[PDB]
Design an enzyme around this catalytic site. Structure first.
Site, PDB file in Angstrom:
ATOM      1  N   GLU A 116       0.775  -1.227   0.096  1.00  0.00           N
ATOM      2  CA  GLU A 116      -0.044  -0.061   0.043  1.00  0.00           C
ATOM      3  C   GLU A 116       0.788   1.296   0.214  1.00  0.00           C
ATOM      4  O   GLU A 116       2.006   1.355   0.582  1.00  0.00           O
ATOM      5  CB  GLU A 116      -1.074  -0.019   1.164  1.00  0.00           C
ATOM      6  CG  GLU A 116      -1.536  -1.316   1.553  1.00  0.00           C
ATOM      7  CD  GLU A 116      -3.109  -1.397   1.326  1.00  0.00           C
ATOM      8  OE1 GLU A 116      -3.817  -0.157   1.236  1.00  0.00           O
ATOM      9  OE2 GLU A 116      -3.740  -2.339   0.786  1.00  0.00           O
ATOM     10  N   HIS A 154      -4.611  -2.803  -7.620  1.00  0.00           N
ATOM     11  CA  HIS A 154      -6.196  -3.286  -7.094  1.00  0.00           C
ATOM     12  C   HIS A 154      -7.235  -3.258  -8.054  1.00  0.00           C
ATOM     13  O   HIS A 154      -8.217  -3.762  -8.228  1.00  0.00           O
ATOM     14  CB  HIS A 154      -6.419  -2.850  -5.689  1.00  0.00           C
ATOM     15  CG  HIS A 154      -7.208  -3.612  -4.910  1.00  0.00           C
ATOM     16  ND1 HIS A 154      -7.989  -2.982  -3.704  1.00  0.00           N
ATOM     17  CD2 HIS A 154      -7.725  -4.532  -5.113  1.00  0.00           C
ATOM     18  CE1 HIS A 154      -8.509  -4.003  -3.293  1.00  0.00           C
ATOM     19  NE2 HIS A 154      -8.802  -5.236  -4.125  1.00  0.00           N
TER      20      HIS A 154
HETATM   21 ZN   LIG Z   1      -6.886  -1.506  -2.801  1.00  0.00          ZN
END
Ligand SMILES: [Zn+2]
Length: 180
Positions: A116, A154
Protein backbone atom coordinates in the site's frame (compact mmCIF):
# COMPACT_ATOMS: atom_id res chain seq x y z
CA UNK A 1 17.95 -4.59 -0.62
CA UNK A 2 17.68 -7.98 1.07
CA UNK A 3 14.91 -10.23 2.42
CA UNK A 4 15.20 -11.82 5.84
CA UNK A 5 13.00 -14.87 6.39
CA UNK A 6 10.10 -13.24 4.49
CA UNK A 7 10.57 -9.84 6.05
CA UNK A 8 12.00 -6.63 4.62
CA UNK A 9 15.48 -5.91 5.99
CA UNK A 10 14.77 -2.18 6.01
CA UNK A 11 11.17 -1.97 7.24
CA UNK A 12 9.53 -1.38 10.59
CA UNK A 13 8.14 -4.71 11.79
CA UNK A 14 4.47 -4.52 12.82
CA UNK A 15 3.42 -8.21 13.01
CA UNK A 16 -0.34 -8.33 12.48
CA UNK A 17 -2.57 -11.16 13.66
CA UNK A 18 -4.41 -10.78 10.31
CA UNK A 19 -2.86 -13.49 8.13
CA UNK A 20 -2.93 -17.16 7.28
CA UNK A 21 -1.41 -19.64 4.90
CA UNK A 22 -1.20 -19.46 1.14
CA UNK A 23 -2.79 -22.68 -0.20
CA UNK A 24 -0.20 -25.32 -1.13
CA UNK A 25 2.30 -22.90 0.40
CA UNK A 26 2.57 -21.47 -3.11
CA UNK A 27 5.16 -18.79 -3.84
CA UNK A 28 3.57 -15.44 -4.67
CA UNK A 29 3.93 -14.48 -8.34
CA UNK A 30 1.94 -11.23 -8.60
CA UNK A 31 2.40 -7.75 -7.12
CA UNK A 32 -0.73 -5.77 -6.35
CA UNK A 33 -0.42 -2.05 -5.78
CA UNK A 34 -2.91 -0.42 -3.39
CA UNK A 35 -3.46 2.98 -1.80
CA UNK A 36 -4.95 3.81 1.57
CA UNK A 37 -5.55 6.86 3.68
CA UNK A 38 -7.24 6.98 7.07
CA UNK A 39 -9.38 8.83 7.56
CA UNK A 40 -9.81 9.37 3.77
CA UNK A 41 -7.59 12.12 2.36
CA UNK A 42 -5.50 12.41 5.50
CA UNK A 43 -1.97 11.11 6.05
CA UNK A 44 0.33 10.43 8.97
CA UNK A 45 -2.01 9.03 11.59
CA UNK A 46 -1.90 5.72 13.53
CA UNK A 47 -5.09 4.36 11.95
CA UNK A 48 -3.57 2.36 9.10
CA UNK A 49 -1.39 0.32 11.43
CA UNK A 50 -4.44 -0.31 13.63
CA UNK A 51 -6.93 -1.33 10.92
CA UNK A 52 -4.40 -3.83 9.61
CA UNK A 53 -3.84 -5.37 13.06
CA UNK A 54 -7.51 -5.56 13.92
CA UNK A 55 -7.48 -2.94 16.70
CA UNK A 56 -8.91 0.19 15.14
CA UNK A 57 -11.22 2.22 17.38
CA UNK A 58 -14.55 2.20 15.50
CA UNK A 59 -15.35 5.42 17.35
CA UNK A 60 -12.20 7.47 16.61
CA UNK A 61 -13.69 8.98 13.45
CA UNK A 62 -17.07 8.75 11.70
CA UNK A 63 -15.44 6.75 8.87
CA UNK A 64 -14.06 3.96 11.09
CA UNK A 65 -17.33 2.43 12.28
CA UNK A 66 -17.78 0.89 8.85
CA UNK A 67 -14.34 -0.61 8.54
CA UNK A 68 -14.16 -2.11 12.04
CA UNK A 69 -16.37 -4.93 10.70
CA UNK A 70 -13.59 -5.53 8.24
CA UNK A 71 -10.80 -8.03 8.66
CA UNK A 72 -8.13 -6.89 6.24
CA UNK A 73 -4.38 -6.57 6.10
CA UNK A 74 -1.55 -5.85 3.68
CA UNK A 75 2.08 -6.95 3.53
CA UNK A 76 3.57 -3.44 3.48
CA UNK A 77 2.69 0.21 3.77
CA UNK A 78 4.94 2.90 2.30
CA UNK A 79 4.17 6.20 4.03
CA UNK A 80 4.39 9.76 2.60
CA UNK A 81 7.99 10.28 3.76
CA UNK A 82 8.96 6.90 2.40
CA UNK A 83 8.89 4.98 5.66
CA UNK A 84 8.27 1.27 4.97
CA UNK A 85 6.08 -0.65 7.46
CA UNK A 86 5.55 -4.42 7.24
CA UNK A 87 2.69 -6.41 8.71
CA UNK A 88 2.95 -9.87 7.12
CA UNK A 89 5.89 -11.94 5.89
CA UNK A 90 5.72 -12.33 2.16
CA UNK A 91 5.44 -16.12 2.12
CA UNK A 92 2.13 -15.78 4.03
CA UNK A 93 -1.39 -14.70 2.99
CA UNK A 94 -2.31 -11.12 3.78
CA UNK A 95 -5.89 -10.05 3.20
CA UNK A 96 -5.62 -7.20 0.75
CA UNK A 97 -7.39 -8.04 -2.52
CA UNK A 98 -10.87 -9.17 -1.48
CA UNK A 99 -13.03 -10.49 -4.32
CA UNK A 100 -10.64 -10.27 -7.26
CA UNK A 101 -9.41 -11.93 -10.46
CA UNK A 102 -6.16 -11.96 -12.53
CA UNK A 103 -5.78 -13.79 -15.84
CA UNK A 104 -8.61 -16.18 -15.00
CA UNK A 105 -7.49 -16.90 -11.42
CA UNK A 106 -9.66 -15.72 -8.51
CA UNK A 107 -8.81 -15.13 -4.85
CA UNK A 108 -5.69 -13.11 -5.55
CA UNK A 109 -4.70 -13.09 -1.85
CA UNK A 110 -3.60 -16.63 -2.60
CA UNK A 111 -0.74 -15.81 -4.99
CA UNK A 112 -0.11 -12.06 -4.64
CA UNK A 113 1.76 -9.73 -2.33
CA UNK A 114 0.04 -6.48 -1.44
CA UNK A 115 1.88 -3.18 -0.97
CA UNK A 116 0.00 0.00 0.00
CA UNK A 117 1.00 3.60 -0.81
CA UNK A 118 -0.36 6.13 1.61
CA UNK A 119 -2.19 8.46 -0.76
CA UNK A 120 -5.31 8.79 -2.91
CA UNK A 121 -6.29 8.15 -6.53
CA UNK A 122 -6.07 11.86 -7.39
CA UNK A 123 -3.18 13.10 -5.34
CA UNK A 124 0.36 12.78 -6.53
CA UNK A 125 2.48 10.21 -4.69
CA UNK A 126 5.87 11.36 -3.39
CA UNK A 127 9.39 11.02 -4.70
CA UNK A 128 10.19 8.99 -1.60
CA UNK A 129 7.34 6.62 -2.33
CA UNK A 130 8.49 6.00 -5.89
CA UNK A 131 12.05 5.31 -4.83
CA UNK A 132 10.93 3.11 -1.92
CA UNK A 133 8.31 1.06 -3.81
CA UNK A 134 11.02 0.43 -6.48
CA UNK A 135 13.48 -0.75 -3.83
CA UNK A 136 10.91 -3.16 -2.37
CA UNK A 137 9.75 -4.48 -5.73
CA UNK A 138 13.40 -5.06 -6.81
CA UNK A 139 13.79 -7.03 -3.60
CA UNK A 140 10.73 -9.19 -4.25
CA UNK A 141 11.86 -9.70 -7.89
CA UNK A 142 15.17 -11.14 -6.75
CA UNK A 143 13.19 -13.54 -4.59
CA UNK A 144 10.20 -14.23 -6.86
CA UNK A 145 11.36 -13.95 -10.53
CA UNK A 146 7.81 -14.21 -11.79
CA UNK A 147 6.80 -10.87 -10.27
CA UNK A 148 8.91 -9.06 -12.88
CA UNK A 149 6.20 -10.04 -15.36
CA UNK A 150 3.22 -9.62 -13.02
CA UNK A 151 2.60 -6.23 -11.52
CA UNK A 152 -0.88 -4.73 -11.31
CA UNK A 153 -3.19 -2.35 -9.43
CA UNK A 154 -6.04 -3.31 -7.10
CA UNK A 155 -8.30 -1.56 -9.60
CA UNK A 156 -7.01 -3.91 -12.30
CA UNK A 157 -8.02 -7.07 -10.45
CA UNK A 158 -11.20 -5.69 -8.88
CA UNK A 159 -12.68 -3.41 -11.59
CA UNK A 160 -15.93 -1.60 -10.67
CA UNK A 161 -15.16 -2.52 -7.07
CA UNK A 162 -11.81 -0.86 -6.37
CA UNK A 163 -10.17 2.21 -7.90
CA UNK A 164 -6.86 2.17 -6.03
CA UNK A 165 -4.21 3.14 -6.86
CA UNK A 166 -5.91 5.46 -9.37
CA UNK A 167 -4.78 7.67 -12.28
CA UNK A 168 -2.37 9.21 -9.82
CA UNK A 169 -0.12 6.13 -9.95
CA UNK A 170 2.47 6.74 -12.70
CA UNK A 171 3.19 3.27 -14.07
CA UNK A 172 5.81 4.80 -16.36
CA UNK A 173 8.00 6.17 -13.56
CA UNK A 174 7.55 2.98 -11.56
CA UNK A 175 8.53 0.43 -14.22
CA UNK A 176 11.56 2.53 -15.08
CA UNK A 177 13.02 2.05 -11.59
CA UNK A 178 12.30 -1.70 -11.68
CA UNK A 179 14.46 -4.63 -12.95
CA UNK A 180 17.45 -2.23 -13.36
ZN1 LIG B 1 -6.68 -1.69 -2.77
Amino acid sequence: MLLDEGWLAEARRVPSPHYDCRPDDENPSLLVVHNISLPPGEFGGPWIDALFTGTIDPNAHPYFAGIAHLRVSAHCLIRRDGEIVQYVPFDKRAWHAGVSSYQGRERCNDFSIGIELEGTDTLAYTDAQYQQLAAVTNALITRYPAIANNMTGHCNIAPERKTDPGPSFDWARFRALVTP
